[PDB]
Amino acid sequence: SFPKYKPSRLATLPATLDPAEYDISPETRKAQAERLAIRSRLKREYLLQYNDPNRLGVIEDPALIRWTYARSANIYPNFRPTPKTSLLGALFGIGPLFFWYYVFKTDRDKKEKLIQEGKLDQTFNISY
Amino acid sequence: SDAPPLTLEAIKDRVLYVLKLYDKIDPEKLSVNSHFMKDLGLDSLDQVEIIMAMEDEFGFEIPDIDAEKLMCPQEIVDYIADKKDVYE
Amino acid sequence: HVTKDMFPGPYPKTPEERAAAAKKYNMRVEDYEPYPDDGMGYGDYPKLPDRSQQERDPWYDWDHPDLRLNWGEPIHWDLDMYIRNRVDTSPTPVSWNTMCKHLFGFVAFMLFMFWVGEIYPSYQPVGPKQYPYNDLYLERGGDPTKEPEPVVHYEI
Amino acid sequence: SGYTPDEKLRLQQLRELRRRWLKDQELSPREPVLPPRHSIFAVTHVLIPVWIIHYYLKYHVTAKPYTVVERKPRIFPGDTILETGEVIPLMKEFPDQH
Amino acid sequence: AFSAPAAYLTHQQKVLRLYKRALRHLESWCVHRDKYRYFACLMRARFDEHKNEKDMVKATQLLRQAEEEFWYGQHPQPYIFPESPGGTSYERYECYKVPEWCLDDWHPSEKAMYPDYFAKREQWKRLRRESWEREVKQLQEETPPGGPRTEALPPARKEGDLPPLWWHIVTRPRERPM
Amino acid sequence: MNPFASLTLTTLTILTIPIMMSNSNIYKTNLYPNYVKTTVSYAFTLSLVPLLMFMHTGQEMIISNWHWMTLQTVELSLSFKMDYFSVMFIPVALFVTWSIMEFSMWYMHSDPFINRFFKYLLLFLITMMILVTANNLFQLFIGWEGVGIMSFLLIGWWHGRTDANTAALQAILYNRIGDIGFVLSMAWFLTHSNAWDLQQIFMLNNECPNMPLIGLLLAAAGKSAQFGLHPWLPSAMEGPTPVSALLHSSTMVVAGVFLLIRFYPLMETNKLVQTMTLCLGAITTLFTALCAITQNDIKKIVAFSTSSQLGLMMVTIGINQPHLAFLHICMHAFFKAMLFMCSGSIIHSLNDEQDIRKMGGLYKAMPFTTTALIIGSLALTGMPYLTGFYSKDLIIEAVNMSYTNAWALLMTLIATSLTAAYSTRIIFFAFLGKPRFPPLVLINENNPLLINSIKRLLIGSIFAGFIISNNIPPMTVPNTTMPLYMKMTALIVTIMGFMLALELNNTTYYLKFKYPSQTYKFSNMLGYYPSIMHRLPTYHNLSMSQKSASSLLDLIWLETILPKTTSFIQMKMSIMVSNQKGLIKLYFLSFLITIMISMTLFNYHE
C-alpha cells in the first residue's frame, strides 16, 4: 500500500515495524519477564551500594572489567592461525607496505631521471 | 529577567483552566481530586489528549509511561511540581 | 573483588559451557550467543545486537545517563564505536539505499552538467580586450631588450 | 491503569522529602558571611600602549633596514614633489570628446 | 522516567502511543492551529472507527498497518520540545549539576560562610545515617527469595520510616542548578 | 614617524590587555564583560583612523618588527600586512564584535560563566586579527588554527551536552581536512619559492603551477564550508547564539575566501584553479540555499543562508573579481550578524524556542525586532540602494558579463531566487499569522543593550554600502554596457522567488493534507549527506582501527612473528635438551658416536 522501508546496517529496522513484537507466544512473554527479572536484580544490587552512606570510592563493575579484558588480554589466547586469519593478516599488514613502496619508488625514479637529463626547473630551490 | 518563580498555586490554576476549556468536561462538576475515568467518564484515547494539552500549556514533554497514570488534576500538578522543583 | 572465574574464557564447545558463560555474563542462555569460533580472538564474549547507544530509550532511568548503560549489564564489544558521540545506527525516515541513490545521482548529475557547461561556455558578443603598448609587453614582465612583434589596434 | 496505592504513597513521601530538601537549599539573610577617574581608562588602555609602540617602532624597529616598507605614493600628472620640487607634465592634450 | 518499566507493553498501550505520536507528527505537518484541530478530529475519528474491535488478530493487523502508514507518512523534522531528548536544550544544564558530596571537600574557610546551610546539611546527613539499616531490613523482608521481579520500590510502611533508597532521588541537584 | 604603523599595531595590541587582566580582580567581578566591550569599542574607534588615511592617500605598509628565527637562507619574522584588505576588514570586524558583545551582555546574562564567555569571544577576535593581518604563511597558519580552536571551545560551550561536543569535534575534523591543503601549500611554497612571506611568493611565481593553488583551494573549502566539507557549519549552531552571530556567520567563516583573496595575484594566472573555484562556489551556493527553504529551526535557516553567501563569494573569486568578493564579505557581515541577533532576540523572548512552527504573530508583539529583521532580509535580497546591493548585484552582473561555465551561471541565478524564497519563509512563519507559542507570554524587548546593539548594526545595514563604495578607489573595470534584460536580472529573479515562495506559503492555510514529495525529503534532510557521510566512512574507519590495526596486526600477528615464535622455539628446544632420564648407558653411547664423528669428520681432513 505504501513504499516499504527496508533496514540496513547503519539504519536499522524500527521496533514498530518489527513483526516479532506482533506474534507473541506465552514463551515470548516468559522470556521478557525473565529479562526484566535479570535487569531488576542488577538494578537493586547497584542501588544498594549506590545509596549506602558508608561506602566511599568507586563501585567496581564486573561488566566493564570483562569488556576491557576481552578487548585486550583475552584475544591472543583465543587466536588460531586459520586461512581467513592468515589471509587477512598478510593482506592488511603487508599489502599496504609494498603498495606504498611501489608508489614512492616509481615517483622517485621518475624524479631522478628528470634531474639527470636537466629538465625539472629546480630554480630557487635553496632549501631542502 | 527570565521566567518568574512559578509556584504550586499557579500550576493548579493553569491545569484547571485548561481542563475547564475542554468541551467534554463541564466546569461546575470538575474538581481538583476528580478522577478522569470514574468521575468524568472519559476513555483512554480522551485521556491522551489531556496529557498533550498539558504539555502544550507548560511547554515540556511528559513520557508515555509517566503520562498514562495521571488521572486527576492534583496528580498532574504534583508531577509538574516534581519536574520543575516547585516546593511552594 | 572479581574472582578469576568471572573473566572471559575460551569459546564454549558444549551446551553446559554455554550455560555457564551466559550465567557469567548475566544473560539468559536462550539469549546468549558467542561470536563464531574462528581464530579472531573473540572467545566466549557475547555477541550483542549491533545497535548504537542512541537507539536506546532516552526516557529510561539509566545508571549512566550519558552512556545509556546499566551497571552490571553486558557491554557490546564495540561500545566505544557506538557511544553516540560517534557512529549512529538509528532508523531513518528514508531507508538506506534510497538516500544513497538520490545523493549519488545528484552529485553525478552536477558533475556532468558542470563538464557540459565547460564544453559550451557562456560569453558576450565582443572581441578581445585591447591593450596599447605592445599589449603591455614591458609591464607584463619586461625583457626590454627584445622589441616584440607589433600588436596593432585600429579604430572600428 | 494509574498508580498502585503503594506507588502513590511512596511518591507522596518522596515528594515531601524533596520539597523539604529544596526548602533547605535556601539561604539566610546573613548567609554570605564574608570575612574582613573621569577619563582614566583612555590613558591606561590607549595612550600608554600607543606610547610604547610608537617608541618601539620609531627608535628600534626602524633602526634595521627594510623593517617598515611603505607602498610608493601615487604620482599624477600635475603633482608637485616635496623633495625635488619637480612638476609632472600634464596629460597630453585630451581628444576633448564632450 | 520516574515509573518502573514493565516486561512489555499491552495492546492498549501500543495503540495509545501510536495515537500520541501520530497526533504530534500531524501537528508538525499542520503548522496552524485550526488546520491541526480539523485533521486531529479526523484522526480521532479514524481511531474511534475500530475502538471496540474484539478480534485480536484483526486488531493487531490494523495496528501493524497503522504503524506502516505512520513510518511512511512521518515528518522527517518533527517538532521537539526544547528540553526533550532530541531538542535544542536537552542536556544544556548538565555541566552545572554538581553532586552534593563535593560539599564535603570544601575548605573550612569555604564552610565558614553559610553556617546555617551546613548545620542543616549535618542534620540531613544524620537523618540519612540513622535510617539506613531499617531501609535495608525492609527491602530484604519485602522482596522474594529469588530476587525482585520489577524495579518498583516499596514505600515506608511504619511510622518513623523513610522509603528505602531515597537519598539520591531526594538530593537531586536541580533542573536549573546555576 | 607617520602614525599609520603605530595606530595599526596599537589597534591589535590593546585587544590583548583584557586577556592579561584575566587573573586580576576585575575578572572575578561582574564588570568584566562591560570592560571587554569597552575595550573593543575603543579599538574600533582607533582602527577608524588608518582607514581614513587609506581612503585619503591609499597608504599601505608592511611591518616586520620581530625576527623570530632564521633557517639557512629562509628568515621567518613577525610581519603584518596593512594593505587595503586588512585596514578595511579590521574596523568592520571590530564594529560587529562590539555590537555582539553588547548583545551578549543581555542574551547570556544568567550564565554563571559569562566572564569566561567574554574572554573566549575576545580570544577569537585576537586570533582573527592575527589571521587577517598576517604577512607570511606561518603567522597566517597561527591565526588559522587559533580561530579553529576558539570555534571548538565555543561550539561546545555547554560541555555537558553530547550533541554540542559532537558538533565541536565535527568542526575540528572538517577543518583538519582543509588544513592538509594549507600545509601542502606551505611545503610547496617553501621548497619552490624559498619563502613563506607574501612579497617573495608574488615575485617568484609569475605563472603559478596547479598544486599550491589546489592546496589553497582545499584549505578555503574547509574553512568556508563549501559543498565537499559543508555540513559542519549548520551543526555549529549547537553553540550559544552570540557565538553563531560572531564566528559562524560573519567573521570566522570568511577566512577561506580571505585566503584566496590574499593570493589573487597567483590565481590570476591559473585558469584551471579559477574554474574549480567557480564550480565549487556554484554548487555550494545552490545546494545550501536549496536545503534552507524547507528548514524549521531559524538558526539552521540563517546558517544555510550564510553558507550560500560564502558560495557566492567563492563564485565571485572564480571569475577573477577578488575585490568584489572582499566588498561582499564586508557588506554581508553587517546584515548577517544583525539577522542572527534578531533570531536570538526571538528565541530569548520565547523561552529558548528555535522552531519557527511555534513562533506566531510577532509583527506587532516585537516591533523593533520585526523592523530590524525586515531590513536585514531586504539587504540580503539585494534590494536597491541597501548595503547588500552595492556588492551582490554587482556580482550577478559580473557573472553575466564573463566567460563563465554555463551551469555555474544557471546555478547562481537559481540560488539568487532561493535566497528570497527562504527570507520569505522566515518572515512568513515567524512574524505573520496568529500566535503558536505557549500561552504564558514572556515577550519583552525593552532592554537598552539589545536595542542599541541591534540599532548600531541596523544603521550599517542601510548606509555602509553607499559609504564604503564611494570611498574606495576603483579596483576594476566597470560593466558600463549591458542589455537591459541582463541589467535587471537579479531583481527579476529575486522578485520571482519572492512571489513563488509567498504563494506556496499562503497555500499552507488551506484545509488539505497530503504526504510530502521525494524532493521535499531530499531538501529537508540535507541531500542525505550527513545521514550517509557521517555514518559510512566513520563506521568503516573506526571498525578497521580495531578489527585489523589493533587486533589482527598489533595484538595477534606482530606478537606471533617476533616474540611468540621465539618463545615457543626456545621452550621446545629447552624441553628437548633437558629431557634426559639420567641413564649413563644412553649418553656414554652418545659419547661413542661423538668420538667416532670427530675422528673422521674433523680428523680425516686436516
Ligand SMILES: CCCCCCCCCCCCCCCCCC(=O)OC[C@H](COP(=O)([O-])OCC(O)COP(=O)([O-])OC[C@@H](COC(=O)CCCCCCCCCCCCCCCCC)OC(=O)CCCCCCCCCCCCCCCCC)OC(=O)CCCCCCCCCCCCCCCCC
Ligand atoms: C525569469 C526567467 C526564468 C523563468 C523560469 C520559469 C519560471 C519558473 C519555473 C518553475 C520553477 C520552479 C517553481 C516551483 C518550484 C517547486 C516548488 C514545489 O511546489 O515543489 C513541489 C515538490 C515538493 O512539494 P511537496 O513535497 O508536496 O511539499 C510539501 C509541503 O509543501 C512542505 O512544505 P514546507 O514548509 O516544507 O515547504 C517546502 C518548500 C519547497 O519544497 C521543496 O523542498 C521542493 C522545492 C524544490 C524547488 C527546486 C527549484 C530549483 C531546483 C534546482 C535543482 C537543479 C537541478 C537538480 C537536479 C537533481 C537531479 C538528481 O516550500 C518553500 O519554502 C518554497 C519553495 C521554493 C519556491 C521558490 C523557488 C524559486 C527557485 C526556483 C525557480 C527559479 C526561477 C528563476 C530561474 C532563472 C533562471 C535564469 O517538488 C517538485 O515536485 C518539484 C521541485 C522542483 C524540481 C523537481 C524536479 C524533479 C526531480 C526528479 C527529476 C527526474 C530525475 C531523474 C534522474 C536523473 C539522474 C541523472
Ligand SMILES: CCCCCCCCCCCC(=O)SCCNC(=O)CCNC(=O)[C@H](O)C(C)(C)COP(=O)(O)O
Ligand atoms: C502524520 C501521521 C501519519 C499517519 C499515521 C497512520 C496511522 C493509522 C490510522 C488509523 C488507526 C488504526 O488503524 S487503529 C488500530 C487497529 N486496531 C484496534 O483499534 C483494536 C481495538 N482497540 C481497542 O479495543 C482499544 O480499546 C483502543 C481502541 C486502543 C482504545 O482504548 P481506551 O479507549 O480503553 O483507551
